[model samples]
Target: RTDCYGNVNRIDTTGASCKTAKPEGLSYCGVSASKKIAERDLQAMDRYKTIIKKVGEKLCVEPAVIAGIISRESHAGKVLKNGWGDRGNGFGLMQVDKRSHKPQGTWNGEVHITQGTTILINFIKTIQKKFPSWTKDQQLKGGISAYNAGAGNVRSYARMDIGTTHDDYANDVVARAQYYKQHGY
Candidate 1:
């Protein structure tokens, strides 16, 4: 059995009992797990590094910042079905939509990594520019929400205080980014 914190409370598979923390050299609170990809090939990681760096530089954000988003969003480069509503074909390492994106284009097979990251970068830039009165930190928070939910929705979300609902978008993204800080992706 595992504890609420994901730490192993006991291992009875063999009727063996283990200490909760540091039975010898285990983390008491347990180590957080990273999302695993089907493949961790060098070529794949390099492609992400290239695209995210380009997008980050273009958007005036750090490459690591962009990396954190891609890591948390799609787990580096694994393309999987969205677990919401009718499952749709998501594209690239960033998982841009195949159906509902603006301009009504199908990204099922045509969306490139550069283009996908570009879409995300544009959204980030657009939101920060829209709310110029806010500090950079605020802009980034708003930008994160905008990236996840369009700018209009982001503005609406900002109207409400943080932690009001499960849809407190910015806080979630910021928390994910913060998670990357403690555990390097």
Candidate 2:
């Protein structure tokens, strides 16, 4: 995606260099689809798909599930290469937050695929452990939560009895997850 300019988000990263007092006008802040050419990005998507599939298999999570997370977070690595926050809050292909120790961008000198997949595996286990009382659907819901809000907040959301927020970050990913499941890479 791009902004008003025709610069591509994945390539032509010139937009990121343009600084503005308000982040609203910045190209990276609000990416526009006009600058994106999905057809041209097929090869990149295939690369990411292979990486996620390999990583997901190693971690025991379904490749589709990993693809879903990537789809929701970074549009399959088509946007946001670096972490969102200055301190590395939401980074890389996964948008893993730093403050939460969720693994940020592929940078921060920690972008290794092995460790990243390990993080995904940990999320699966954490979600399973967090919601033992819920049904199958609820368990999946918790897994999505782990994908978004991190496992630390899972209990709090559970305590509040908010199984899934209408705009719940995790629940949203579940939809993307389902999409990836129906359509293989």
Candidate 3:
């Protein structure tokens, strides 16, 4: 299994279904997946590239994925004030959903970055636990989608499009991830 993904032991197909070879960059939900946005914000990530890589090394996540989230959530901290987004609802570069948990670190600090990635890792692990039949890539996508919509809502691959702006939150995130991956993010 890759550091970013794996399968669960329990297979409950009533709620979750799997599809082979699904494209990660295809937007199924909202307008979150914009090459323009990713391009615009990628340059801003240069300051944090090394930090993101360090977090990925420690957390078993991809730097590209972290960069992708930063691009999606706060546009690399552009639309934020002191790391707060959603009009102070979310916090940090990764935009941790503060309605559920307290913001863990300063918006641009490594602690906050690591904390957000830690939450992402937990979600990825839960996705692996929930969808044992899914391929590792699918599990990663599910976890990424869950980052925005919560794992409880993403019951299947098709359901990744649910519960986000324009029904494409996960899709946009993954697409941005691919973009970031190509650019050495």
Candidate 4:
């Protein structure tokens, strides 16, 4: 449930201070990938909306979070070739890592959405198990980072960004999720 595990991505936002780049006012657009790509990814996600919402609702996950991960992981399946990315090691809409776990379902089918979303839910629970005192928002942030960097690599709640690609993965995903929410994902 959203009470214990978040249904949507949550963040510790500054009133107006940029958490990653503090030069200017706080902007929720922490994702450095450029909004142009996000728009493209959003378009890529249009066909999958029905499945994403259905799976998210069934799984107690957020559709926007799924969109956020899809946007961040494989550019909403736009960057995939032959159904894989990360040099063919990651697969599908959520880009389930081939190195860590076997590929499931079709490249972007409902089953794969369920697979990845279930993995994400486990990651959130893992975070909660490890850091029992963190707020639900912090736990979801940890879950997001662990999806990128692996839960074993995440040692603390305050620094979920430590092992991520840009140390901004969680922030960017949540920002992207917020954007998706604005568009009624």
Query: For every candidate structure, what is the RMSD over all alpha carbons to the true structure, in angstroms?
Result: 12.8, 11.6, 7.1, 4.5
Q: Which of candidates 1 and 3 is the stronger one according to lDDT?
A: 3
Model 2 deviation from native, Cα RMSD in Å: 11.6
Count clashing residue pairs per candidate.
0, 5, 7, 3
Cα-based lDDT for every prediction? 0.43, 0.46, 0.71, 0.75
lDDT of predicted model 4 = 0.75
TM-scores of the models, in the order given: 0.53, 0.57, 0.81, 0.84
lDDT of 2 by residue, 1-185 (tens): 10111111112111111121022233441122111222233445567766766665555556655554555555555665443533446666666656656563353222544455466557656766766665545555555555554676677434421332223444434444444544563
Clashing pairs in 1: none
Candidate no. 3 TM-score: 0.81
Error of 1 at 105 (Å): 13
Superior candidate under TM-score, 3 versus 4: 4
Candidate with more favorable, higher TM-score: 2 or 3: 3
Best model number under lDDT = 4
Task: Give the local distance difference test score of model 1.
Answer: 0.43
Tens-digit per-residue lDDT, 56-94, candidate 3: 877777787888789878878888987788567899889
Using TM-score as the measure, name the better of candidate 2 and candidate 4: 4
Q: How many backbone clashes does candidate 2 have?
A: 5
Encode model 1's per-residue lDDT on 6-74: one tens digit a residue: 111111111101221233233422222121111222234445555555555554455544554555455
Best by TM-score: 4
Minimal lDDT window, size 10, model 1: 7-16
